[PDB]
């Protein structure tokens, strides 16, 4: 059978967020390529370069018109006119607005589509952007993180193929079966906190057993997300919080990239 | 005299620009664009010097980790901090299971497509492709029953008309060598790899917290709590998980990535002779062992007009002569000050002007090293170390040419390493030596805590006044990568990055002199201008990424 | 002639003693013997209806989950509930993929020592093992390389003089037919097994919360949560990670357990003119799936004098005539009250007086059907979906005779069905045809779940008044179970276990017949009365648990 | 290289605890007996049977004296002169004494042999008691559960190899790494538990969204265990709680197999 096409274009990205992918395993990035979907754009793994890939791109919007995801990562820059990213000499923000224009979902991977990001902190040289701001006439579907858990976007994109519509969405257009509840509303380490058994060093006496990273700098009592119960690269009791430091805040917006590692978050 | 533009070049990571003139089918001058900014040392600027690891970590996905650690060396130079040996343990495994994913991804999901051809490889016969490893591998996943499963893959995507990522690829061009059954031995191996890469991730994850962009540093040590008899922390359960994946990592890269490197070489040997990028190659040592930042694994240094024999050595993250000669200029670079720049005095203003031939073209500096273009990355780390005479080296270097002179009856002499081919043998020989890197960095990790250290952790004093100076070196998957830091009144005051890809992607410099990039391709010969595979082949043995080399 | 005893028999679970009179080289009269019992059914007793299930399932960790799910049909039984059709997808993907697991480690771990001789392995070829098996199996994971490597794990234990678990077997024994090549095979296939049971049991694990001893039944349904966009529930994410795993059993279960299954019958077709227990048979239809308790995916029914074309098909778990004809009888047995009982009337009142051979001599009870002996589990399984007609089981059957066919040149008629080597055939038909009842039930739950359906479960009521009793029945790997249980006032007033090793296993009845184990052994050559390995042969082949017979 | 010698015995056990070691993946059970360890006597995995296999025990017995590790699953049934466990017709209890005289270590497996577990419920028709209770002048290593996270197991196993003597254990002989903490005060469900945010039905609201467990009967606030951290089967995510399920007790003496499932635990 035929499999439903998906169009991904980098912006202002790092590749994190196509990385996540090598990590995940249901499905593993082959079955995803072979099976799931057909990538019909994607210019870390493309065979055809240059010429040829912006053709085999031109040709694959035409063919798919209401029918292809398009997937962003990365911020996109508006500073002078478009030029802190060009490719095929032309400015990334014209290539996102023409191919969002046939997008049956378009779907924001990572913070910095989401919101920014790392990309459009402190003084924000290149007046980096959201996806959904270079989009205000679209409904973008933001998956946060940095990157986020590869299977937040794995099961979004399987939820639209299985049952033709998206996953239910929050008031900032996330997935709730992900970001839908607070870090410290699911915390393994909340009873340390409701105690007052807190690490003060890392390497400490509290710290080698387990205690609440709080007074570190945690910030799950201000950041939604799934990092607690979900985790990370399916092994089992993998997350920042699991191996000893502090959430950083990476999912939410004035939190990660804004606030210092040992600054304390704000308590409900 | 044709122009040709390679706009976007894929299989990298990040956004390059290649353009060429050519004459009469050959390359005669070439020009590397890489053309998105982020101006990640301004956004790290103003902050808190424990806080610059998590930020920096984000100038690339790819060669994650990478920068986190480049960074808090930084600040420990800066600060005077003598790293815990747990610390340094933790930090050496991570860096290595790291860099065991991102050369094997390399080679097969980057590089493989300039020298496969997966229409060919429908026509295979799987018995015959099985018959020729014979004697040449003991890998158990070379039968005909695999590879013919692998094929009806193919057959099946063709068939569908969705061709996808594999879609207006260079199906047929004069320049694809391989016989069909090595084209179907190659697409069943690039398969495989995904499953080994997985399990060196596995490993980063469980020390680092996830992965990608670990979350397990500190400007003092790491944040993992060492306690074998603690529930929820680094335990004895925890560490067998941990090398219960390192034991799953060495059968693929012997018996199937250093087999097929030496495969590609004995069916591509005019490959031998083209791609020389410089005459000048360096490498920082890395894996410290010692409660002083020091007595490294890995050695590093200096080579001159391909000298092995008069060589300098790098001993020491400190070494002066290394610091005091590295400079970065931006006169045909898209930033404002143009004259050479030492790190801990540079700036980054923008100054965009558009594409000119003979002014501005990119976003990358121009690195040099007392005035000279320097080639950094796997084939600097291979030459230093046979240079310095390290025998682990020199035998891994020879397995390599045994398998080479099985199929050819040739060998390789030393001269023939300056090349696209030499290039990549020096990355999977690296990859091969990084596997006992791991067996001796965790067996000293239980040994330590079996001593009674359980230790990760020296926590920092920042003076509120004064102006003082660090720099981080590592020895990344790219090559040499230095984190330049100044703090003054207890906040960032510069920070400067100087990336493995910045050296060899960077523009002409100040003397208006070539970089790796651009003087490899000199005399590439190109069959079909419309169509310039053999560009892309020299570009892809160097390991691109615009991410790191612009930041 | 003489007397020998087998105590223990290894290789089966739980505490088993088998006795035989030997006359003129074969096997006169045998005795078999369960030497351990707990008293799991008055423990269960007087507790509430909805807490038995947690404790019963603690009668057999190897058929871990199956007293679980007879408890809450038992109870649901009695109480006239309809089990939500979500909760019966749920319940099902368990028991299929359990049923997997443990049908792979009987053929392995368990039996394939009493027919490979591992010593023999070390002579073998691994070039010519990997091409008899050229056009016999599409397996992956035949090579010569495969194979070099576990022959050189074979030596290596050899050569440590620490043999351990491997020592001290029938090594060069006359019975042993294999050559050098096929016990490789077989060695490297052994180690194989572990990976795709281990895969069956994740499937189990992300839907019982763990195993061994699974936790998400309740009576009324099941405890997962089915909300696709919930954090922390049963979702889609979690949904894709089940389907993962089960795509992953495919493969082995055709290729590898299928092929061995044909290929030992090849080697030792004696075997399947030898040991027939018993010329009745009985199974339970399985996998329920509509909102009633019924629509079974497989048959069930009861054969007579092994007459298949006068069979009675069972299709209901209320079955009257199924119910109606279980009695359990003491005479041979250590426990006081002896005349045959229904189980709703049953008791267990230890009585041990020490080992008599016309007396008692076993602590398992004596079941029968309407007063005579029957067999269960997968043989009577295979026999009674051929009776019924069903087109898969005749297919699967099929391709295993046209393997053996291939080897031999012969074909196998149902008559050397009722057999050691047929018993063993149908437990291998069952495992493959449960991989596309997997397939079919995660597709079935995706389905309802999208139509709106979410419900999982029916809070029950209990009257605290009068009497209710309830029996639940499942057709486990080993055979048709079933749970009986009487409430009075509100409480468990009785409660009686009839499981599938007590049919075979147990003694004597009251009318002095023989059950299966005990028939099956009359006739059986001995060569060397020392070393019995012929009688362990046949006993292995039904599976033996003996924390199941006695409780 | 030689491998350390271990004896295995059963008793009154259901083969749960055996089973275990076939889900563990560090080490797997192959590379357990073939690298790890010599299993010098399990009856479930054994090629030899009869005269032989008793045989065999003897042999280890006398050769490894003073050296091996005895591992004992199930309990050991005194009533009636030993007759409710006979193997090779003499009571179980005989041949675990004689065993245990020559052990360099000394573990039970499993809440069975750690307390009498589920076999000394009830009436305890068989007198079944603990490993320790018949072992009173010898220190027994208890590793409860029914059946334990088999790494509980093998961890404590690798600590007396590795490092020369057992993992640091706690006022009952438990391990502290798996048994040194409350699953209550270390649970990721504590935040619903301290909002009383609760399911009062299985497939209720509450319970769909995955709120605390305390009034559906969950142990965890009696119940020593890694439960909620280590979890089971290394796949992520999976313990009783996390599928939808109260914990029931079965780490701990008094609560396991003697409390309803339904019945409301105590709160320190
Ligand atoms: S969200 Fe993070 S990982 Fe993804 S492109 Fe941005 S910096 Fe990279
Ligand atoms: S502050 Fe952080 S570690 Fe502590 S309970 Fe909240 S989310 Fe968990
Ligand atoms: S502890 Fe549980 S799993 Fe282990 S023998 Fe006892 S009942 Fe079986
Ligand atoms: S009662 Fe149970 S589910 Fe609730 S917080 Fe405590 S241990 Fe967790
Ligand atoms: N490796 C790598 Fe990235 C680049 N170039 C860095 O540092
Ligand atoms: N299968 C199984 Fe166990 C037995 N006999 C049960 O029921
Ligand atoms: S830093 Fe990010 S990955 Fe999760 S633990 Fe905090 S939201
Ligand atoms: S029932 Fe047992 S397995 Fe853990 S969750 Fe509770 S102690
Ligand atoms: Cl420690
Ligand atoms: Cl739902
Ligand atoms: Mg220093
Ligand atoms: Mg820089
Ligand atoms: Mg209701
Ligand atoms: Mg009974
Ligand atoms: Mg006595
Ligand atoms: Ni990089
Ligand atoms: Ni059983």
């Given at each position: 059978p035929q499999r439903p096409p998906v169009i991904w274009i980098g912006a202002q990205e790092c590749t994190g967020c196509t990385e996540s992918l090598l990590r995940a395993?249901?499905?593993?990035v082959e079955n995803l390529v072979?099976?799931?979907?057909?990538?019909?754009?994607?210019?870390?793994?493309?065979?055809a370069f240059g010429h040829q890939v912006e053709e085999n791109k031109h040709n694959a919007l035409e063919k798919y018109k209401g029918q292809y995801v398009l997937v962003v990562d990365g911020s996109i820059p508006l500073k002078?006119?478009?030029?802190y990213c060009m490719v095929a000499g032309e400015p990334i923000v014209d290539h996102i607005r023409k191919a969002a224009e046939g997008a049956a979902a378009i779907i924001a991977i990572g913070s910095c589509s989401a919101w920014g990001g790392v990309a459009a902190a402190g003084v924000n040289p290149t007046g980096a952007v959201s996806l959904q701001e270079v989009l205000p006439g679209k409904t973008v579907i933001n998956i946060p993180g940095?990157?986020?858990?590869?299977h937040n976007f794995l099961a979004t994109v399987a939820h639209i193929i299985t049952y033709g519509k998206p996953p239910k969405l929050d008031?900032?257009?996330?997935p709730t079966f992900a970001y839908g509840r607070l870090i410290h509303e699911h915390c393994e380490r909340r009873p340390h906190f409701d105690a007052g058994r807190?690490?003060?060093?890392?390497?400490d006496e509290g710290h080698r057993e387990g205690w609440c990273l709080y007074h570190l700098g945690c910030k799950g009592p201000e950041t939604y997300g799934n990092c607690s119960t979900?985790?990370?690269?399916?092994?089992?009791?993998?997350?920042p919080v699991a191996i000893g430091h502090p959430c950083?805040?990476?999912?939410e917006e004035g939190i990660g990239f804004h606030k210092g590692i040992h600054q304390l978050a704000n308590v409900e | 005299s044709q122009r040709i533009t390679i706009?976007?070049?894929?299989?990298?990571e990040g956004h390059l620009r290649i353009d060429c003139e050519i004459e009469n089918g050959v390359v005669s001058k070439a020009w590397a664009s890489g053309?998105?900014?982020?101006?990640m040392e301004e956004i790290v600027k103003?902050?808190?010097?424990?806080?610059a690891w998590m930020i920096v970590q984000r100038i690339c996905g790819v060669c994650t980790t990478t920068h986190a650690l480049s960074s808090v060396r930084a600040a420990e130079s800066a600060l005077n901090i003598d790293v815990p040996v747990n610390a340094q343990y933790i930090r050496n495994i991570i860096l290595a299971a790291h860099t065991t994913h991102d050369h094997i991804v390399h080679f097969y999901?980057?590089?493989?497509l300039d020298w496969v051809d997966i229409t060919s490889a429908?026509?295979?016969?799987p018995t015959k492709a099985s018959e020729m490893l014979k004697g040449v591998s003991t890998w158990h996943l070379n039968s005909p029953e695999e590879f013919t499963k692998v094929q009806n893959k193919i057959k099946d995507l063709v068939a569908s008309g969705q061709?996808?990522?594999?879609?207006?690829?260079?199906?047929?061009?004069?320049?694809?060598?391989?016989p069909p059954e090595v084209n179907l031995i190659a697409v069943a191996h690039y398969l495989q790899a995904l499953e080994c890469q997985r399990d060196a991730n596995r490993v980063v994850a469980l020390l680092?917290?996830?992965?990608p962009h670990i979350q397990?540093?500190?400007?003092?040590?790491?944040?993992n709590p060492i306690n074998l008899?603690?529930?929820?922390?680094?335990?004895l359960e925890r560490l067998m998980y941990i090398k219960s994946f390192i034991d799953k990592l060495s059968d693929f890269v012997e018996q199937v990535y250093k087999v097929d490197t030496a495969v590609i070489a004995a069916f591509y040997?005019?490959?031998?002779?083209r791609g020389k990028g410089a005459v000048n190659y360096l490498s920082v040592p890395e894996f410290p062992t010692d409660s002083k930042n020091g007595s490294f694994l890995f050695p590093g240094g200096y080579i001159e007009?391909?000298?092995?024999?008069?060589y300098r050595p790098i001993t020491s993250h400190s070494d002066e002569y290394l610091i005091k000669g590295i400079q970065e200029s931006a006169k045909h670079s898209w930033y404002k000050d143009e004259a050479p720049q030492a790190p801990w005095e540079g700036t980054t203003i923008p100054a965009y002007d558009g594409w000119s031939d003979d002014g501005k073209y990119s976003w990358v500096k121009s690195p040099t090293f007392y005035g000279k273009t320097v080639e950094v990355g796997p084939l600097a780390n291979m030459l230093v170390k046979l240079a310095a005479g390290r025998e682990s080296t020199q035998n891994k270097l020879n397995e390599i040419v045994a398998i080479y002179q099985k199929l050819t009856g040739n060998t390789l002499e030393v001269?023939?390493?300056?090349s696209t081919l030499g290039r990549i043998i020096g990355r999977t020989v690296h990859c091969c030596e990084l596997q006992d890197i791991l067996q001796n960095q965790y067996s000293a990790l239980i040994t330590n805590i079996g001593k009674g250290d359980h230790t990760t952790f020296v926590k920092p004093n920042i003076p509120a006044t004064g102006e003082f100076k660090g720099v981080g070196f590592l020895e990344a998957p790219k090559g040499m990568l230095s984190h330049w830091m100044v703090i003054k009144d207890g906040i960032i005051s510069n920070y400067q990055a100087v990336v493995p890809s910045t050296w060899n992607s960077?523009?002409?410099?100040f003397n208006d002199d070539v970089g790796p990039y651009e003087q490899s391709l000199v005399g590439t010969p190109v069959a079909d201008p419309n169509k310039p595979l053999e560009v892309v082949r020299t570009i892809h043995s160097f390991d691109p990424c615009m991410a790191c080399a612009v930041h």
């Open positions: 395993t249901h499905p593993t072979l099976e799931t979907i057909s990538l019909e754009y994607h210019e870390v793994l493309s065979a002078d006119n478009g030029i940095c990157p986020p858990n590869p008031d900032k257009n996330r807190f690490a003060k060093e890392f390497g979900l985790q990370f690269c399916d092994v089992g009791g993998v997350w950083y805040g990476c999912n | 706009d976007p070049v894929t299989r990298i053309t998105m900014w982020r101006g103003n902050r808190d010097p424990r806080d999901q980057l590089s493989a429908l026509q295979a016969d061709l996808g990522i594999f879609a207006n690829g260079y199906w047929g061009h004069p320049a694809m060598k391989l680092g917290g996830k992965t397990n540093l500190a400007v003092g040590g790491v944040a008899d603690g529930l929820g922390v680094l335990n040997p005019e490959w031998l002779t007009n391909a000298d092995l024999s008069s001269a023939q390493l300056h960077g523009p002409r410099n």
